[PDB]
C-alpha cells in the first residue's frame, strides 16, 4: 500500500562530516489526533540484524548517539549522522508503522570515501583437466578498484555475446576498502576449439581507454 | 532482558514445507505481538506478518496469507510460521521481532532459509595459470576456479592458509542449479613459479578436500 522510496542509493562519505539520508512516502504518515508520524529508522551492520535507531520520525531510541538526528514529517523525511565514525558503516531503512502492510526502504548503504585505482585485470585460460572432464570456461579477474562502478565485455576473435557469461562481485573491503570482481566464459570443449582471440575489456573512470587482456588459443 | 533466538538454517526442496522457531524469553510472552520479516538479496525487507500470543492471534500481510502461516504456544515460549509449497524466490533470511507501538525494536537472530533441487555435489576445482605467452611484471596472479558444488560455502585457502596476502575471494554463483566460484592471488614473480603454489578447497557437505598446484 504505502511506498518508502528511500534516497540516496549509497552514499560514500569520508568520516568527520556529516551526512544525510531521505525517505519519502507515498501518503502521509503523521496521524491527525496525538500528531506523531509513524516512521522508523533502522540499522543494520555488515550481515546481522537491523537495529532501530529513531522513532515516530524525531525521537532516538536509547542506547544510540545524538548523532542520529530525525525529522521530517508528512511524506519526506530525514536522517542526518552529524560526525561518521567507523561504527557507522551499515545500511539504513525507514520503514512505516501506519497502515497495513508494513512497509520498509530499499535502504542506503553507506561506504567509505577513497581515491581512483585502476582494476588489476588478468585473464586465464581453461585448464587441461577442465577439457579432459567437461568443458572450457575462460576466467578473467578485476582487483582492488574504487569505486564499485564497472563494466566488463568479453570479445572472441570479433563476435560477442552474454551467454555464458557469469559474473561476481566483492563487497567492499574491510582493510583497504577497495572492490573486486570476477568474470567467466562457460563454454563447451566443441566450440572452443574454433575460435583464437579470446579477450577481456573493462571500463573504469581512471583510464579513457579500457584495461584490454587477450589470449590466443 | 529480552531475547529471540531462532531456528537454525533449512536447506529443503522446493514444493515442500518448512516451519521454524522464534523463542522469546526475558519478558511476558503472552503479552506482545511478534512479527515476521523477510530479508531477501536484492529485494530489501518485507513485512510477512505478526502474531499475538493471547486472544486475537494472527494478521497476515496480503501476499503471505496463503503461505506462512503463524503459530504460537503460549506455554513453552516459542513463535512458529509455517511455510508451504516452497518456491526457489523463497530463499531469503527471516527474522522474528517483537513488534511495538512505534516500531520492533528487538530482533532475532535470523533464520536463513534456501530452497533448491540440487543434489549434494562435491566440486570440481582448476588451477588458472597466466600462461607461457605472457608480460609477467613483477607480481604474478593465480587463480583457483571452483565450479559445480552444492550446498553451503567452499573454504578456500593458499598454501594451507599460509599465504593470505592479495588473495580475493568472490561470491559463490548459481550455475545450471549449481554454485560456482572463484579464487585470485597475487605473489611475486621472484617465487612462482619458482615455489609451488597451491589452493585447497574443502566441500563441508560432502565432507571432501582437493589441493591442486598450479602450474604453468
Known amino acids: 500500500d504505502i511506498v518508502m522510496t528511500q534516497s540516496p542509493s549509497s552514499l560514500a562519505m569520508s568520516v568527520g562530516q556529516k551526512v544525510t539520508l531521505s525517505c519519502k512516502s507515498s501518503?502521509?504518515?503523521?496521524?491527525?489526533?496525538?500528531?506523531?508520524?509513524?516512521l522508523a529508522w533502522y540499522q543494520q551492520k555488515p550481515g546481522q540484524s537491523p537495529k532501530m535507531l529513531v522513532y515516530?520520525?524525531?525521537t532516538r531510541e536509547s542506547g544510540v548517539p545524538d548523532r542520529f538526528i530525525g525529522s521530517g514529517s508528512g511524506t519526506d523525511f530525514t536522517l542526518t549522522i552529524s560526525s561518521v565514525q567507523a561504527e557507522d558503516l551499515a545500511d539504513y531503512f525507514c520503514?512505516?508503522?501506519?497502515?497495513?502492510?508494513?512497509?520498509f526502504g530499499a535502504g542506503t548503504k553507506l561506504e567509505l570515501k577513497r581515491a581512483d585505482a585502476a582494476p588489476t585485470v588478468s585473464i586465464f585460460p581453461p585448464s587441461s583437466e577442465q577439457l579432459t572432464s567437461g568443458g572450457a570456461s575462460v576466467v578473467c579477474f578485476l582487483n582492488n578498484f574504487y569505486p564499485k562502478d564497472i563494466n566488463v565485455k568479453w570479445k572472441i576473435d570479433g563476435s560477442e555475446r552474454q551467454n555464458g557469461v557469469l559474473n561476481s562481485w566483492t563487497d567492499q573491503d574491510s582493510k583497504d576498502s577497495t572492490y573486486s570482481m570476477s568474470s567467466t566464459l562457460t563454454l563447451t570443449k566443441d566450440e572452443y576449439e574454433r575460435h583464437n582471440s579470446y579477450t577481456c575489456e573493462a571500463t573504469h573512470k581512471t583510464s579513457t581507454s579500457p584495461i584490454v587482456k587477450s589470449f590466443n588459443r | 532482558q529480552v531475547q529471540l533466538q531462532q531456528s537454525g538454517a533449512e536447506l529443503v526442496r522446493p514444493g515442500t514445507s518448512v516451519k521454524m522457531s522464534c523463542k522469546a524469553a526475558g519478558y511476558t510472552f503472552t503479552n506482545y505481538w511478534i512479527g515476521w520479516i523477510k530479508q531477501r538479496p536484492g529485494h530489501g525487507l518485507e513485512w510477512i506478518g505478526d502474531?499475538?500470543?493471547?486472544?486475537?492471534?494472527?494478521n497476515y500481510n496480503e501476499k503471505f496469507k496463503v503461505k506462512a502461516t503463524l503459530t504460537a504456544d503460549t506455554s513453552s515460549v516459542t513463535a512458529y510460521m509455517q511455510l508451504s509449497s516452497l518456491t526457489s524466490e523463497d530463499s531469503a533470511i527471516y527474522y522474528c521481532?517483537?513488534?511495538?507501538?512505534?516500531?520492533?525494536?528487538?530482533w532475532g537472530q535470523g533464520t536463513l532459509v534456501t530452497v533448491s533441487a540440487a543434489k549434494t555435489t562435491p566440486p570440481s576445482v582448476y588451477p588458472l595459470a597466466p600462461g607461457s605467452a605472457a608480460q609477467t611484471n613483477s607480481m604474478v596472479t593465480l587463480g583457483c576456479l571452483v565450479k559445480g558444488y552444492f550446498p553451503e560455502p567452499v573454504t578456500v585457502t593458499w598454501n594451507s592458509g599460509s599465504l593470505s596476502s592479495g588473495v580475493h575471494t568472490f561470491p559463490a554463483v548459481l550455475q545450471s542449479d549449481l554454485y560456482t566460484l572463484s579464487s585470485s592471488v597475487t605473489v611475486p614473480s621472484s617465487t612462482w613459479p619458482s615455489e609451488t603454489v597451491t589452493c585447497n578447497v574443502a566441500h563441508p557437505a560432502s565432507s571432501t578436500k582437493v589441493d591442486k598446484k598450479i602450474v604453468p
Open positions: 520503514q512505516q508503522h501506519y497502515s497495513t502492510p508494513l512497509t
Open positions: 501518503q502521509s504518515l503523521l496521524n491527525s489526533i496525538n500528531q506523531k508520524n509513524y
Open positions: 502474531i499475538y500470543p493471547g486472544g486475537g492471534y494472527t
Open positions: 515516530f520520525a524525531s
Open positions: 521481532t517483537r513488534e511495538g507501538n512505534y516500531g520492533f525494536a528487538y
